[model samples]
Target: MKVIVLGSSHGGYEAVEELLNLHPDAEIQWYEKGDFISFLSCGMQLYLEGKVKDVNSVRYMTGEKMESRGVNVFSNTEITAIQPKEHQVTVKDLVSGEERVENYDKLIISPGAVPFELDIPGKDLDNIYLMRGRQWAIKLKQKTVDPEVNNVVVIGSGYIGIEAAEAFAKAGKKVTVIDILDRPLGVYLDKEFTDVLTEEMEANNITIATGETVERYEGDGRVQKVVTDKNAYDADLVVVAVGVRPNTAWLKGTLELHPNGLIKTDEYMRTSEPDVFAVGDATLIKYNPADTEVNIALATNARKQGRFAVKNLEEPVKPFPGVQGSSGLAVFDYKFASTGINEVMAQKLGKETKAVTVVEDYLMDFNPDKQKAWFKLVYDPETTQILGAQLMSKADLTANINAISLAIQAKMTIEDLAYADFFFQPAFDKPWNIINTAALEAVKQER
Candidate 1:
C-alpha cells in the first residue's frame, strides 16, 4: 500500500507518523512544503519573548528523523492539485521546480492554515509581517532582537495580538496593539473578562488600542508608521495577526467548501470524497456536542482529528468525544486559559445560561505560596450542564481549564463540578480548587 500525505503541520505530521508505526511493511511518502514536520506555532509568542531560548528547539520533529524512520521525506515539496476522481495528485518539487504525477491508494489532506490578510494601505510593505508557519518565525527571530527594530505595533486584539504585544516589549522594543474589536480576546471572552486581561497587559508598558482600525500604513516603503483612521504612530515593524483562514481554496469546485473556503468533514474526519481524509486547520469541524459545523484551526483539534482519522481507518483507538476549544496564553507573569462556550457564545445560542466568576488565591491569601487565580464558570439553566469556563491568574492555570473541558465533555452538571472529587494540597491549591469554588458560586446563583 502506498500513502501520500499533504501538509506537515499538526494533523499531517500525526497521520504520517502513526501510519508508519502502525504498518511498517507499507511504503509511506510524506511531503511538506517546508522542511519541518513539527514547529510549534502555539509557542511563537514565547519565542519572541526570549522565554524560549532557541526557536528551532521548539520543533516536535525534524526532517532528518522522518528520513531515518524509513519514511520517504520530501522537504520543500508542494501538492499543486488533487484529482480525487482518479486518486492522483500533481506534486511539484520545490527545490528543482519539477512536477510529477503520484498515484496513491490513500490520500490525506492536511494543508493547514494561513494567517489572515489585513487590507490596510501599505500592508504589503517589507517589514509588515504575518505569523503562521516556519517562515514567519524565522522573520521574527532575525528581526525581533535587532537593535534597529525599535517601535513595534501589532494589529488585532485577539489572543495572538495581545501576546505578541508583550513579546515585543519583553525584547526591549516599544509595543502597541490595535484591534477593531471592543476588547482584547473579545471574540473568545466577553469584555467583562477581557478588560481584566487588558489591565494586566497595560501594567507591563504595552499600549492597547481597541475599537480602532488601521486605516493605512504611512511609511516611505518599509512600514515606518501605522496610521489608524483617528491617528498615526511610528512603527519600525508591524505584525498583522488579525486571525487565520483555512488553506482549502484549492478544493473549491470539487469538495464541499463552507462560506469561508473551509472543507467540510464528518465526525470521522472524512471529506465528502471517499478514501480522501482531511484534517488540521484546513477542514470544517463538526462540533458533535453542539451538533453544528464550524471552522476552528486549533493544534489540539488538529492532533485529535489526526489520531481519530487513523483510528477510523483501523480499529477504534479512542472514542473522540468532541471539542471544547481549549487554549491558553501567557503574558508577563500571568496565564489565561479557557474551555467550552463562553458567556457571549452561550448568549448567542439563545440558551438560558448563568455565569459566576470570582477572584481568589490559589493558596491561602496571606500564605507564602499564594497566587492570584480567578475563574469563571458558565452553565446552561435548563440542562444544568457545565457549558464553559475561563481562567486568569499569576500561576499555572492549564490544569483548571482541563478539568472544565472534561466536565463539559462528560455532560457534568454545575452541582457535579461544584462538589467533584479532585486532589488538593496547600502548596498546589486552596482547600476548594478555584474551579470548584467558581462552580459552587455559579450553583448558588441558580438558587
Candidate 2:
C-alpha cells in the first residue's frame, strides 16, 4: 500500500516518523511545498534573536536526508488539488510549473496555516512583514542590524507578535506593540500574569498599547507610521503578528470543513473520506479540559495529531489523546506557562469555576538563591476537580504544567494533587511543590 503525506511542518514530520517506525518497508511519498522538509516557525525567534547562529540550525531534517532513508521526498512542489474519491492528488512544480498526478492508498494531509494579512491602506509597504518560515526569518534578522530601521511597531498581542516586539526591543530599537485585546496574551494567560509582563515590557522601553484597532500604515514607499484608532505611532518597520488561519481553501467542495476553514476529522484522525486522514493547524481536535473540540493550532498539538493519525493507517486504529491547549513564553525577566482553559475562557464556556492563586518562593528561603513563583489553579467550585492551571516565575517552573495537563486528561481532582508524591530538595523546590501547595489551597477554599 502506498502512503502519501502532504506539507512538512510539525505534523507532517511526526507523521513520517511514526510511519517509518510502524512500517519501515512501506512505500512512503513525502511532498513538501518548500525546498526543505522541517522548518519550524515557532523557533524563528531564536534565529531572529541571534541565539541561533545558523539559519539551517532550526531544521528537523532536510529533504535529502529523508530521500536517503528510502522515502520518495518531493521538494519545491505544491499539491494544488486533491481528489479524495479517486485517491489521487494533483501537484505542481513551483519552479518549472509542471503538473503531475500522484496516487496513494492512504493520504495524510497536514496543509498547515497562513499568516492573516491586513486589508488596510499602505499594506503593500516593503517593511510590513509576517513571522513565518525561512524567508521572513532572514528578513527580520537582517533588519535588526539595519541602520535605517529604528522604530519598530508590532501589530498584535499574540505570542508571535510579542516575540517580534521583544526581539526588536532587545536589538536596541524603540518597540511598540498594539493589540485589539485588553491584555497581551489575553487568551492564554489571566490578568495576574499579564499585569507582571506589562511592567517588564515598560521597564525595557517597549511600548504596549492594548485595546486599540490598527487603522492603516503610512509612509512614502517603505513605511513610517502606524495609525491606530487610539493613536498614531512612528514606525520604521512593522511586523504584523495578528494571527494565522488554516491554509485549506483548496479543499472547499472535496471535504467537510468548519466555517473557519478548519478541516473536520474523526477521533481517529479520519477525514470525510475513509482513506484520507487530516492533522495539524488546519484541523480541530478534542480539547479535554472543557470536553469540547477546538482548534488550538499549536505545534505540540500538531505533532501529537501526526503520530496518532499515522497509526490509523493500518490494522489497529490508534485514538488521539485530547489536548489541553498548553503553552508557555518568556518576556525579559519574567516567564509563564498555561494549560487547558484559563479563568477567561472558563467563564466564556459558562463554567462556574473558581480559581486559587498562590505566590510562593521558588526554593526554600534558608537555602538561598531566592525567587517568587505565581501559580493559579482553576477548577469546578463544588467538586474541586482540576480544570486548568497557570504557572509563572523567573525560574523554569513551566514544566509543572505538564503534570496538570495529564491531570486534566485523567480528570484528577485537586484532592489527588494536594498530597501527590512529588520528590523535593531544598536546592530545587520546597517541601511542598507549587502544584502540591496550590492544590492544597484549592481544597481549603472548598471547605
Candidate 3:
C-alpha cells in the first residue's frame, strides 16, 4: 500500500511512526513541509529566556530518526494540493521549484497550523515577528543577543505571548505585553488567579496592557515603536504571538473542511473522504473534559489522534477519549498550566460551572525549598465532578499536570481526588501536596 503523510509537526510525525511500527509491510512516504519534525512548540519561549541554553536543548524528534525507523521522509517539501476524488496530491520541493503528482492508497493530512497573520500598517517593518513553531524560536534566539535589540513588545497574552514576555524580561529587555483580553492568560485562568499573574508580572518588570488592540507599528525601515488603540510605546522589536488556525486552505475545495479550515474527522481520524485521514493542529478533536466536539489543538492531542489514524487502518482502533485541552508555559519564577475548561470558556459556554480557587505550596508550605504553587478547580455545579483545572507556580509542572491529566481522564470528582493515593516524597512534593489539597477544598465547597 502506498501511504503518504503530510506535514511533520505534532500529529503528522506520530501518525507516520505508528503506521510504520504497526504495518511494517506497508509502504509509507512521509513529507515534512518543515525541517524540524516533532518539536515542542511551547519551549520556543524558554529558548529565549536563557533558561534553556541551546535551541537543541528543546525536546524534539527529527525526520532523520523517523527515517531510521523505516519510513521514507521527504523533508523540506510541501503538499501543495490534494485531490481526494482521485487520491492524488501535488508535492513541491521547498528547496526547488520542482513539483510532482503522487498517488496514495491512503493519505494522512496534517499540515499543522499557521500563526494568525494580521495586517496593520508598518507591521511589515523589520524586527516584527511571530511565534508559531520551532523555527521561529531559532530565529528569535539569534535576535535577542544582538546589541541593537531593546524594548521588546509582545502582542497577545495567550500562552505563547505570555511566555515570550517572561523570556524577554529574564533576558533583561524592557518588555511590554499587549493583550486584547481582560487579563494575561484570561482565557485559561479565572479572574482571581489572573490577578495573581498580573501582579507577578508587574513585580518582574513586565508591563502588561490588556483590553487593547494594536493600531499600527511606527518606524522607519525598522520597527521603533508599537501603537495600540489607546497608547504607543518605543519598541525595538515586536513579537506577534497571536493564536493559530488550521493550515487546510489547500484542502478547502478538495476535502471536507470546517469553517475555520480545520479538517473535521471521525473517531478514527478519518476525514469525510474515504481512504483519507487527518490529525494534529490542522484537525479538530473533541474535548474529553466537556464530552463535546470542539477544537482542542494541542501537540499531545495530535499524538493521540495519530495513534488512532494508524491503528484504525488495520485493526479495531479505539476512539480517542477526547481532550482536556491541556497546555502549559513558563515565566520568570513561575509556571502556568491548564486543562479542560477554565472560567472564561465555561462561562462563555453557559456551563453554569462552579469554581474553587486554592492557593498553596506545591511542596511543603515551609519546606525551605518548595516553590510557590496554586491550583483552581472548575466543575459542573450539578455533578460535582472534576471538569477542569488550572495550575500556576514555579515548581516543575510537567509531571504535575500529567497527574492532573489522569484525574481528567478518570472523571474523578473533587472528593475522590483529594484522598487519592499516590507516591510521596518531600523533596518533590509535600505529604499533602497542593494538588490534593486543592481537590479537598473543592470537595468542601457547596454548589
Query: TM-scores across all candidates?
Result: 0.94, 0.97, 0.92
Query: Candidate 2 lDDT, tens digit per residue, 1-447?
Result: 789999889888888889899878889998889886788688888888889888888888788888888889888999899898898999999989999999999999999999998999999987999999998898999999999888999999888998999899999899999988889878888999888989888888998999999999999998999999999999999999998979989999988999999999988899887688899999998999989888898999999999998888864467777888999889888889999878668767777788899987868888778788999999877777789999999998899999999998898999999988998988889998999999999889888
lDDT of 3 by residue, 1-447 (tens): 888988676778777878878888788898977676666776776577777777765766776777787788898888899788898989999889699999999898788888886688997899888887777888788778878777989999977788788777777788899978878987777777788788888998989999888899999999998999999978988888888867777787787888888888888888888888888888778776777777766778888888789887754467776777887765566677888778777867667777787776666766788766778877767777878888887676545666777787788887787898866898878776666778778777763
lDDT of each: 0.79, 0.89, 0.80
Model 1, residue pairs in steric clash? none
- Number of the top candidate by TM-score? 2
Error of 1 at 306 (Å): 1.2
Error of 2 at 248 (Å): 0.5
Candidate 2 colliding pairs, count? 0
- Per-residue CA lDDT of model 1 for 276-390, tens digit only, reads 7888888766553354555666888888787677666643345556787878877677777887777556655555667788877778766797866778888777878888888
Better of 1 and 3 by lDDT: 3
Model 2, residue 359: C-alpha shift (Å)? 1.4
Ranking by lDDT: 2, 3, 1
